């Protein structure tokens, strides 16, 4: 027989707090968990709206309904609980993420688009020059105009460009991002794009990878179809963090081990937070908050 729990929480950060929810579904002796934590500025839905939809969905599932949610964060969180219940989300994971860097398969991540383009190009060249066997993933989050893209590349030695594993969504438009890629020889990745209507997995010169943030994307099943479509075209697919708590981050670790076995995931966001909850990320020294101490809604 079906039973469940719903929690709400707010974790302090080093975003002042990270606000989200959890769902626990049980069937008999089985149990599955999931995290529903929309990200302000990326997810369309709010924490409050996700809370309403998740409570309704839970009520209905408790009542026997089979309908799955459409709201992305809820769809994700619920799909994980259900996969756990059915034992389809493997337990194994390496729990290793590409480290998030500033300045200093060796793979690391650097966010760009915060400082001006030249500074980012200079910072990037310095690193690459400094660590000859380093491979960098760069995240622009559509920060640049074509000009800015040229400005960034100008400071990056062509002979180190092959070591930029991908630069996500450099430009405001896909055509401009594609043009930047072709001209600079710097590989790019799609991230936000995959979430736009009408997106199609197609071979494109200069595109080498996609970044999938499941909390933004939707169900695990949808994440799996996108990973697979990326793989079928020969692209790298990276499972990436939406600043989930430790619970969802660990799940993301398992999803990566399972669906993107040879690709280290972009989960280096735990240290931005003050505590872990429910499930530990191995090696973290953050305190852990137990179920018992969370705000229960259902």
From Swiss-Prot:
It comes from the Bacteria. It comes from Escherichia coli (strain K12). GO terms for biological process: menaquinone biosynthetic process. The active site is at residues 111, 213. One of its GO terms (molecular function) is magnesium ion binding. This is o-succinylbenzoate synthase. Its cofactor is Mg(2+). It catalyses: (1R,6R)-6-hydroxy-2-succinyl-cyclohexa-2,4-diene-1-carboxylate = 2-succinylbenzoate + H2O. The gene is menC.
């Amino acid at each position: 027989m079906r039973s469940a729990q719903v929690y709400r929480w707010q974790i302090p950060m080093d975003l002042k707090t990270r606000d989200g929810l959890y769902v626990c579904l049980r069937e008999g002796e089985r149990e599955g968990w999931g995290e529903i934590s929309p990200l302000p500025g990326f997810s369309q839905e709010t924490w409050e709206e996700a809370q309403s939809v998740l409570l309704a969905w839970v009520n209905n599932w408790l009542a026997g309904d089979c309908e799955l949610p459409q709201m992305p964060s809820v769809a994700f969180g619920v799909s994980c609980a259900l996969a756990e219940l059915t034992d389809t989300l493997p337990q194994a994971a390496n729990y290793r993420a590409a480290p998030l860097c500033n300045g200093d398969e060796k793979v690391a991540k650097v966010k760009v688009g915060l400082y001006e383009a030249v500074r980012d190009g200079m910072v990037v060249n310095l690193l690459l020059e400094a660590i000859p066997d380093l491979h960098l993933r760069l995240d622009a989050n559509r920060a640049w105009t074509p000009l800015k893209g040229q400005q960034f590349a100008k400071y990056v030695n062509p002979d180190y460009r092959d070591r930029i594993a991908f630069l996500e969504e450099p430009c405001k438009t896909r055509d401009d991002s594609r043009a930047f890629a072709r001209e600079t020889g710097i590989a790019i990745a799609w991230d936000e794009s995959l979430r736009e209507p009408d997106f199609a997995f197609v071979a494109e010169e200069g595109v080498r990878a996609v970044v999938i943030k499941p909390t933004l994307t939707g169900s695990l099943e949808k994440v799996r179809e996108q990973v697979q479509a990326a793989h079928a075209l020969g692209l790298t697919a990276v499972i990436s963090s939406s600043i989930e708590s430790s619970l969802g981050l660990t799940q993301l670790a398992r999803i990566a081990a399972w669906l993107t076995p040879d690709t280290i995931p972009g989960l280096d966001t735990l240290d931005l937070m003050q505590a872990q909850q429910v499930r530990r990320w191995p090696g973290s020294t953050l305190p852990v908050v137990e179920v018992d101490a969370l705000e229960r809604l259902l």
